Write a protein that binds this ligand. Structure first.
Ligand SMILES: [Mn+2]
Ligand SMILES: [Mn+2]
Lengths: 205, 205
């Protein structure tokens, strides 16, 4: 069965950038609910119930048609938030191979940040902004709702291995930022965990 | 040229049910942005800028490819929010006819409420729940993002003339209700404008 993962830090660990009230609600209510809904949907499907969630979401086309959507949404949500929590940490520095890759692919760190900010800002409605690796190269893309690039292009409109991502559902920012998503996106730069992104970049799948 | 309509009441006129902080931000920031972005996109389309917004979103398939998404989203947003403001008011009572296409399609007020709450709660990500008039037949439907049943099935997954509707984008309910959308949905019952809904049940068109 899926379970809500413990966070790697306290709910106030990302202050003063992401707010503690949101962190706590986002984890204990939003994320918990994706877990609960996915488990409920997987009760009747013992062949799928047991796989890591990162695997289940690559196999959505194999599910019964009447289970496709509920698991796309909820196993997607469980996958994405699990990555998100581990992908946030204060005090990290972009450096090494990842940094060199960003500069190579976007020309500069500032162009990369610009391109991610725009992708994050223009995702209309609920969704995610991602840094993804595919074919030796970095790119920035966004997905709808809880879709992940790991689900493939047919389903998500995106593809590749996520290196890092930012939740742009309004629940992730409305308490402190209201409508000002670009402010929330700039604050992300203060808390994106570059050590974990590097580790994913080395691993590459 | 679209004009942001003024609200039919003060920001606090829906208290204690819908919060005044949200009424103000929702109108002066979110609605303002939709108007702006539809207006900007319509500047090169004097052919279409003349139509009422509610007629424009019926014609999305007649726009020039690179215009369809921007106007779907933003003309949809302007249309939906304009209806939303007029469709909110305290102190009204469902009665009279607005009960006359129901129980060949619903069977009681409480049944209809239960169907409406289902659609509102089940809408995954951003969108809207609607009471629509489909020829002869009320029905409950929901749409994604700023889609409207007025855009048709092919585009919105929905159809019918909107009688009334609830905004379930998180911005509409987060500051007061956070993740508790069902508590927000319960409150909508206390502010849904049955007089305006009844009047529309007359706009049949
Ligand atoms: Mn989230
Ligand atoms: Mn809204």
């Amino acid at each position: 069965s899926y379970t809500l993962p413990s966070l790697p830090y306290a709910y106030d660990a990302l202050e003063p950038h992401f707010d503690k009230q949101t962190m706590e609600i986002h984890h204990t209510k939003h994320h918990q609910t994706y877990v609960n809904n996915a488990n409920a949907a997987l009760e009747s499907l013992p062949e799928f119930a047991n796989l890591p969630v990162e695997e289940l979401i690559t196999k959505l086309d194999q599910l019964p048609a009447d289970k496709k959507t509920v698991l796309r949404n909820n196993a997607g949500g469980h996958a994405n938030h699990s990555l998100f929590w581990k992908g946030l940490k204060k005090g990290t520095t972009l450096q090494g191979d990842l940094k060199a890759a960003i500069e190579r692919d976007f020309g500069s760190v500032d162009n990369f940040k610009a391109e991610f900010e725009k992708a994050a800002a223009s995702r209309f409605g609920s969704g995610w902004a991602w840094l993804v690796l595919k074919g030796d190269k970095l790119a920035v893309v966004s997905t709808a709702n809880q879709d992940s690039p790991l689900m493939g292009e047919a389903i998500s409109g995106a593809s590749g291995f996520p290196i890092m991502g930012l939740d742009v559902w309004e629940h992730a920012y409305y308490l402190k930022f209201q409508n000002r998503r670009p402010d929330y996106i700039k604050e992300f730069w203060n808390v994106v965990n570059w050590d974990e992104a590097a580790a994913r970049f080395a691993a590459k799948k």
